Structures are given as C-alpha cells and as structure tokens.
Design a protein around this ligand. Structure first.
Ligand SMILES: N[C@@H](CCC(=O)N[C@@H](CSc1ccc([N+](=O)[O-])cc1[N+](=O)[O-])C(=O)NCC(=O)O)C(=O)O
Ligand SMILES: N[C@@H](CCC(=O)N[C@@H](CSc1ccc([N+](=O)[O-])cc1[N+](=O)[O-])C(=O)NCC(=O)O)C(=O)O
Lengths: 208, 208
C-alpha cells in the first residue's frame, strides 16, 4: 500500500494527499516528531536527509515531486499523450518555482519580505490563468480534459496563497472558478474539510 | 525538429544539449542577446517570462526539466518501467535541488558564500555516490542499466562543480569514474570538446 512519512504539517505533502484522497486511494500516515527527527537515525537513512519519504509496496521514494509524478504515472493522471505529459510537467515545474519562493518567504524573510512578495504575486499567478484560458476556456483542468498531478499541486499552491494574501485570485476569474470547481469534487471536498487537513499547520514554523 | 532558445551560456541548457548530442539528434540554436531580451517582447511571450524556450515541431515548451523529461520520454531515456522512471525522477529532483543552491551562490553571493558552499559540498554529493554504489557497483548509470535524462543532468552538475571546487570528486570514487566514463561516450566526447560548448560561459555573470 501507500505510506507517507512526514512531519505534522501540510507543506510538501498537501498536494499528494489531496491526490490520493480524490482518487479514492487509501494510505497510511507516519508522523515524525521533531524529537524523533532530532534523534538523527531517520534523517541519516533518508536519501537526501529530508522528508517526505514515501512507500508504495517495497518501493521507497523521496522528493515531493517524484511522489506526485509516480502517483500521476501509475494512476493515469499524467496527460493522454506525450504532448500533454510535457505540458503537465511544464505546469508542475512552474508550480514548484513559485512554491520555492513561497517557502523562502515563510522560513526566511516573512516579516520584511511579505509586502514585496504580495506585490509581485499577480505576475507570478498570471501564467496559470493564461494556461487555463488556452484550455477550453479554463472550464476543465490545467492541461487537457482529464485531471493530472499538476492540478493537485497547483490547487494547493493557490489555496495557501489565498491564506497568505486573501483575495489574490479576485482578479483571476479562471483561477478562482478552478479552485472552487476542484475543491468541490466530492472526495476532495470531504478531505479538505476533514480534521487531518484542517487541524494541521500549513508550514512547520507557524507562519502562513 | 528541435530548437533551443537561450542566452549565450551553458547554464540550464547544458544537460539537454549533451543529451541531444549524445543521442545523435539534430537541433537548432536560437541565441538571445541581452539587448533582444531587454527589448521585452520575447520575454513577455514566454510563459514564465524566462528562458530556455524549446520547440519540438509546433510544441513549445518552457522549464529546463520539462524539456529534459520530454526528451527522455520521447527518446526512451526514462527508465525501463514505471519503477525505474520514479527513481530517475528522484535523481533529477535531487540534481535540481543542488543546482538551485549552486545558482544561488553564483548569482547571489559568490564572494562571501563560496567557502561555506564548498565545505558543505561533500554532504551534497554523497547521495549520488550512494545511488551509484547501489546500482551494479556504480559501473553503469545512475538508474538501471540504460542511460536516462537524469544522467545528463547529473553529469553537468558534477562537471560544473569540479570547475567550482577542483577535486571535489576525489572524495567520491564512483562519481569520479562515472564522470570519466560518460564523458568518454564518443558523440558526447566530441560535443564537450567542440567550440559550440567550449566557447560558451557556464553562467551568465561570468562566475564559475
Ligand atoms: N526537494 C524536497 C524538499 C524536502 C524538504 O524541504 N524537507 C524539509 C521539510 S521542512 C523545511 C523545508 C524548507 C525550508 N526552507 O527554509 O526552505 C525550511 C524547512 N524547515 O523545517 O524549516 C526537511 O525535511 N527538513 C529536515 C531536515 O533537512 O533535516 C522535496 O520536494 O520533497
Ligand atoms: N525554472 C526555470 C528557470 C529559468 C531561469 O532561471 N531563467 C533565467 C536564466 S538567468 C538567471 C537565473 C537565475 C538567477 N538567480 O539569481 O537565481 C539569475 C539569473 N540572471 O540572469 O542573473 C532567465 O531567463 N532570466 C531572465 C529573466 O528573468 O528576465 C528553468 O528550469 O528553466
């Protein structure tokens, strides 16, 4: 089965969890406390000395995007052809780029860098609105007419940014509608309202 | 066919170029000067306002790793099955993580951060030596027994680090032999020695 090993936060596991829940997959959560991590044995055993760690049968993986791509690949959420698969990759890489900036702000310069970050947000979000606009008027998914792992990753990015800068999507009709539409999918809606998601901090340092 | 649109530097296009050359694929280079970029029209037309931009027929792509994964997918350099594909992803994400740190040092604080960076390098290279040690004694490739896009990306990462920290691979026998072995592949060896590779700077700011 599936096992996700992570700290008690949404962070880089939020998207893959949304994917698993929405896809009706069952998985086990292995919560790692700061004490256990500080112990050192687990960390030393991690390929890049970091979490998340993921297990699928006897397959052990590291790197959040590797887990997303693996789930996308094995579950059929990676486009209908090579052309779509590439576009899905293009979206996820763009999502990762912004997530990195978001993470830097959160853990590195929240107080002094928030104003500038929020000021620059529109230009960073615009590309995803454009992508939607070029795909069936933005009425379906980010790429093609079937959901992909990039959709879950983008959704999370949009959700955490609405927390960081409420109303940041107001100027973007497609992104706004997209968030509402995907968040309304039955299994996903139930997961997002559940305590295991709601009662977990977004980041490990309490900022958001 | 293939068209690479980039500034006159190796940077984030070095790995994909090595891949194309080694695979015997033809491609065209579209060099973008600082003046043309500063003009603004090209940049505004780029999905995320950045280069590289790649064209495969009428398919236009952005994001260096998206290009690598697309070429890996289409040319059969993405593992023999789904499991290997995930391991390939795990390697590339690790390569990207280190490349980001390298890029930060180069463009953000080379002078004051070099010492610390080089001091931390061994711990950052270790995971790749470990992966090699676990795959046929490190006698073939980073994943499985066939070359993958992650091999080209990792090779470039190792090459630019030996320039930044001459001798850094002395502490890693497998990685050292791996660099020598892959660099000896006939088509790649010819490309690496060619003016089109050699006469290009590694980075855009002249640091290395
Ligand atoms: N590329 C990896 C990134 C993994 C990662 O960043 N892991 C962190 C999560 S927390 C984290 C992630 C990013 C930043 N940050 O400042 O960029 C700060 C924190 N933190 O705990 O403060 C971790 O395991 N840290 C434990 C360790 O290294 O010993 C992935 O995508 O899965
Ligand atoms: N995620 C993308 C990243 C593309 C990228 O970083 N492109 C830069 C290359 S130069 C670059 C890349 C990283 C850093 N940096 O400081 O981290 C500095 C520079 N630079 O030109 O100084 C660019 O196009 N810049 C033009 C622009 O944005 O207007 C990819 O993987 O392809």
């Amino acid at each position: 089965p599936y096992t996700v090993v992570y700290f008690p936060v949404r962070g880089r596991c939020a998207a893959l969890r949304m994917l698993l829940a929405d896809q009706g997959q069952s998985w086990k959560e292995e919560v790692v406390t700061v004490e256990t991590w500080q112990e050192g044995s687990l960390k030393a055993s991690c390929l890049y000395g970091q979490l998340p760690k993921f297990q699928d049968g006897d397959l052990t993986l590291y790197q959040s995007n590797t887990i997303l791509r693996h789930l996308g690949r094995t579950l059929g959420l990676y486009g209908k052809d090579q052309q779509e698969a590439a576009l899905v990759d293009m979206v996820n890489d763009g999502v990762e780029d912004l997530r990195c900036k978001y993470i830097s702000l959160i853990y590195t310069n929240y107080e002094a860098g928030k104003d500038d970050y929020v000021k620059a947000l529109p230009g960073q979000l615009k590309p995803f609105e454009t992508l939607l606009s070029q795909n069936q008027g933005g009425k379906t998914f980010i790429v093609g007419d079937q959901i992909s792992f990039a959709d879950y990753n983008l959704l999370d990015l949009l959700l955490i940014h609405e927390v960081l800068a409420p109303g940041c999507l107001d100027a973007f009709p497609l992104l706004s509608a997209y968030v509402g539409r995907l968040s309304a999918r039955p299994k996903l809606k139930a997961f997002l309202a559940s305590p295991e998601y709601v009662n977990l901090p977004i980041n490990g340092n309490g900022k958001q």
